[PDB]
Design a protein around this ligand. Structure first.
Ligand SMILES: C/C(=C\C(=O)OCCCCCCCCC(=O)O)C[C@@H]1OC[C@H](C[C@@H]2O[C@H]2[C@@H](C)[C@H](C)O)[C@H](O)[C@@H]1O
Ligand SMILES: [Zn+2]
Length: 880
RNA sequence: GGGCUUGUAGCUCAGGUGGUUAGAGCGCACCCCUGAUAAGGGUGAGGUCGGUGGUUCAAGUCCACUCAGGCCCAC
């Protein structure tokens, strides 16, 4: 054959990647050479960019949401590291909380039998047993970071940071004591947490209590009377107010009885429940609960409380739009009340019994002594209204008895104080988008308060012991010694010994002048542990900085790690943790709905790296618009596979068609190239311009677009093909071949670097197969630089490339009739046209036949009617 | 229900300041190559823009309303 003495592409680079068998090994080497540090070595000094890592929970195996997140930060960090910045990424992990605990007994722990320390550990091995578990994944994603020496909220040094924050706050009047409502089961004498309760049918005594309106102000609007629906009985004796829904009300008002107030929404309902339609005799003088939102009335039981009014959000259906609110046994019931200095009624024993506030209620039952109780004061109190029924009332599993809301000693962070100091910061913090500022600027402006304590045994205990019988020791020195103590031993040294040997060595407080000391139990709400990232790590690892440049997490972090971090950061350094703040949506299924086993639509991470590899996973995340929930489906991945396939294949062609090329020696001066070679050079420039800018705005999707378009249209659909007649024929060192190779070497490599952060594996691969590249690893190479572009040229070829597209519809037609079949078989002839000056135009170009990969062409100035006219001239096609 | 939010071709995405026959790539259909071949080229067919009603001479692009989703509170 005449191909024996031909030129061909040669490289071991496979067409089919097989990343799953490939990626691992490639990692182990980066892990070998220890890139991460050397990454910092390279740069070192220079500028610096910090992307503080939000610590994911140390429990379970990573779901897609992580992948997106971590791959987005990896993109961000790598790129940066490539522009030279000293960007040390430091992975984090959440090790405290309650799941991690529930995930113990749900296996077979058997609580009571151990000891706090006897489980802290047994709820700490697991933690670390997870970190490793989840570490491999993140690593498996080619993500890059201090994984060998990450940070974890349970490290002795971390609590240090943990308590000081609290402390600094404390010593600024913010971390006080108080009371909030909490699920409770007297059949355990302790509290519970949602996950600890299931619901069943309880026989509740539905009642529409006849309440009376009164008092001048509470008389501002006529003087009828007040109804009120509540399915529980004892709730009432713990009275504080009534809140309608300002914006929909109509306090009705009506006949005989004593006239009654409710909402229009219920009017009928009410009557349909109290045999009231004893002639549906309409309403009179209807008010506006919206405004009414501040009246006053006194309720039966003993009404030695002027139950005011307020504006709540939602209360439709049920009974009278009255509600009856008691911030003691109702969560949302707790806020609306509280919002305006409203009490905290009857605590009610560790058992179903109360004491204070209760008249006869002193020694009662939580149930039956709430029942016949309802009675007595019903009639003999102002007469009322009653029903019986079955509900959906909560119960404590494991015991299966009932549970009830109760008041309980708790701690909080004065949000009210700080709100503002925060918001102001919120404003002076930048965002990838915009709605995020809003959303969060609003979270805070409605935040309310921060219950910062749980009765669990796994977490930084709040540093507070008592001594004065009034007690409450919590000031500097006392606080610190705890940190200056927690280090050498850990959050363990609290549950270790007694309050005594944990205070300021030989210290003594005026109160409890008996040397006796009682230390608090309550540990902190994990959002604190995590909220203290800017503390325990950003400001404590010599190679970082406090003002992290940008936090990057998912939309549910706007209240989570975002707020709890800034909320905390401010209350210490009165400034924002992060400078920039980028957010990302969730991962839905195909449609765009939630992923869940019960449906069978959950593309899990691992299962994918194992199938299509991770370089695919990455090219996917890049294909999405994270500014909103992103979609993943097996249909999606194929196209993602497809894409990666083309890309891979394309570097493959170049890799082998530069196999014999060698810059140092061969390359041609730009000044000395074939115009067409220049053209693409520039097109590699334009592309480099537009992609580095894209990288800068964290707009990858935009690259997934360009890279793609560029590859198909510019490379394969053209340059590469046209190039075949050069790279395969002309003497191995003919000025023509070497010219094209000179640009290809660049149209390549330079682009190899541009993809480095998104195709971490494949990048490195193409790198290993590229001659004389001067540096082991694409990931330790500065990115190509952005050079000015000879537009005027780019424009000519845009026109020429147009004309091309025409030269084809002219060919296909001709190729359809069989007049031709493989372009090279035809002789093209176009000429000036009244719609285009084809003649004088095609003057500059050369090898028009070659550019059109045909046999021949000729510009004639004129052609005849017979000649099928096109957009860029008059064309005609003919065999040989 | 509350704050914020998403809905354009099979798929991922574009579509200043409202304005001719709504774009890109992939994919697909078909023809060509078989000297990049578990590759390659060419051509073409697919959206009336979630729905409805308005605003304007004119709306995918502004208003309202509505259906379906999503994160977070309320439950
Ligand atoms: C985009 C995400 C989830 C998602 O898109 O959800 C994907 C779908 C869930 C998987 C379904 C599994 C099947 C179960 C079934 O049957 O339904 C959220 C991200 O997660 C990773 C990180 C988690 C840590 O919490 C964050 C922080 C900073 C705080 C300190 O802890 C990240 O910060 C972000 O939160
Ligand atoms: Zn049941």
């Amino acid at each position: 054959d005449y191909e024996k003495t031909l030129l061909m592409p040669k490289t071991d680079f496979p067409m089919r990647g097989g990343l799953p068998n490939k990626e691992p090994q490639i990692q182990e080497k980066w892990d070998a050479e220890d890139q991460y540090h050397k990454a910092l070595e390279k740069n070192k000094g220079n500028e610096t960019f910090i992307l503080h890592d939000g610590p994911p929970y140390a429990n379970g195996n990573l779901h897609m949401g992580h992948a997106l997140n971590k791959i987005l930060k990896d993109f961000i960090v790598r790129y940066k590291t490539m522009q030279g910045f000293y960007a040390p990424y430091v992975p984090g992990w959440d090790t405290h909380g309650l799941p991690i605990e529930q995930a113990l007994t749900k296996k077979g722990v058997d609580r009571k039998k151990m000891s706090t320390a006897e489980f802290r550990e047994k709820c700490k091995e697991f933690a670390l047993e997870q970190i490793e578990l989840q570490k491999k994944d993140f690593r498996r994603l080619g993500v890059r970071g201090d994984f060998n020496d990450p940070y974890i909220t349970l490290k002795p040094e971390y609590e240090a940071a943990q308590i000081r924050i609290f402390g600094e706050m404390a010593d600024k009047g913010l971390i006080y004591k108080g009371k909030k409502p909490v699920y409770w089961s007297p059949s355990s004498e302790s509290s519970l947490a949602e996950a600890e309760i299931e619901y069943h049918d309880k026989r509740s005594a539905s009642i529409y209590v006849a309440f009376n309106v009164k008092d001048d102000k509470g008389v501002v609007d006529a003087d009828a009377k007040f109804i009120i629906w509540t399915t529980t009985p004892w709730t009432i004796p713990s009275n504080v107010a009534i809140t309608v829904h300002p914006e929909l009300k109509y306090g009705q008002y009506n006949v005989n009885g004593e006239k009654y107030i409710i909402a229009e929404a219920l009017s009928d309902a009410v009557a349909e429940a109290l045999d009231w339609d004893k002639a549906s005799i309409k309403l009179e003088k209807e008010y506006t609960g919206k405004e009414l939102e501040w009246v006053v009335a006194q309720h039966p039981f003993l009404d030695r409380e002027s139950l005011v009014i307020n504006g709540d959000h939602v209360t439709t259906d049920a009974g009278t739009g009255c509600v009856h609110t008691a911030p003691g046994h109702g969560e949302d019931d707790y806020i609306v009340g509280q919002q305006y200095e409203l009490p905290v009624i009857s605590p009610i024993d560790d058992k179903g019994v109360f004491t204070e506030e209760g008249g006869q209620f002193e020694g009662m039952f939580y149930d039956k002594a709430n029942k016949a109780v309802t009675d007595l004061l019903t009639e003999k109190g102002a007469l009322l209204k009653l029903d019986f029924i079955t509900h959906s009332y909560p119960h404590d599993w494991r015991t299966k008895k009932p549970v009830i809301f109760r008041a309980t000693p708790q701690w909080f962070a004065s949000i009210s104080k700080v709100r503002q100091d925060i918001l102001d910061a919120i404003e002076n913090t930048n965002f990838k988008v915009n709605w995020g500022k809003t959303r969060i600027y609003n979270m805070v402006r409605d935040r309310g308060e921060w219950v910062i304590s749980r009765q669990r045994v796994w977490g930084v205990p709040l540093p507070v012991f008592y001594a004065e019988n009034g007690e409450i020791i919590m000031t500097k020195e006392t606080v610190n010694h705890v940190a200056d103590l927690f280090a050498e031993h850990g959050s363990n040294i609290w549950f270790e010994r007694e309050a005594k040997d944990l205070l300021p060595e030989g210290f003594t407080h005026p109160g409890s002048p008996n040397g006796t000391f009682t230390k608090e139990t309550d540990i902190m709400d994990v959002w604190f542990d995590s909220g203290s990232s800017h503390r325990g790590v950003l400001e404590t690892r010599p190679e970082l900085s406090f003002p992290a440049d940008m936090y990057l997490e998912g939309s549910d972090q706007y209240r989570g790690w975002f707020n709890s971090s800034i909320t905390t950061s401010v209350a210490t350094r009165g400034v924002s943790p992060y400078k920039f703040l980028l957010s990302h949506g969730f991962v839905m299924d195909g449609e765009g709905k939630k992923m869940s086993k019960s449906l069978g639509n959950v593309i899990v991470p691992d299962q994918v790296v194992k199938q299509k590899g991770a370089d695919i996973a990455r090219l996917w995340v890049s294909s999405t618009d994270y500014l909103a929930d992103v979609r993943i489906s097996d249909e999606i991945l194929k196209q993602t596979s497809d894409d990666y396939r083309k890309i891979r294949n394309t570097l493959r062609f170049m890799l082998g068609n530069i196999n014999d090329f060698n810059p140092d020696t061969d390359s041609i001066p730009e000044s000395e190239l074939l115009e067409v070679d220049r053209y693409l050079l520039n097109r590699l420039r334009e592309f480099t311009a537009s992609t580095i800018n894209n990288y800068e705005n964290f707009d990858y999707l935009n690259i997934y677009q360009e890279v793609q378009n560029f590859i198909n249209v510019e490379l394969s659909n053209f340059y590469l093909d046209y190039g075949k007649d050069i790279l395969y024929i002309e003497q191995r060192d003919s000025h023509i071949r070497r010219s094209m190779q000179t640009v290809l070497y660049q149209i390549l490599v330079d682009m190899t670097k541009l993809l480095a952060p998104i195709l971490v594996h494949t990048a490195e691969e193409v790198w290993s197969h590229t001659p004389h590249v001067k540096e082991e690893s694409v990931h330790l190479a500065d990115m190509p630089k952005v050079v000015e572009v000879d537009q005027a040229l780019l424009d000519k070829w845009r026109t020429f490339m147009n004309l091309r597209d025409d030269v084809n519809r002219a060919l296909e037609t001709a190729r359809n009739e069989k007049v031709i079949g493989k372009s090279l078989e035809a002789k093209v002839t176009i000429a000036s046209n009244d719609k285009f000056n084809a003649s004088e135009f095609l003057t500059s170009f050369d090898a028009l036949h070659q550019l059109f990969i045909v046999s021949q062409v000729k510009v004639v100035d004129k052609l005849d009617d017979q000649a099928t006219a096109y957009e860029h001239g008059d064309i005609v096609i003919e065999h040989a």
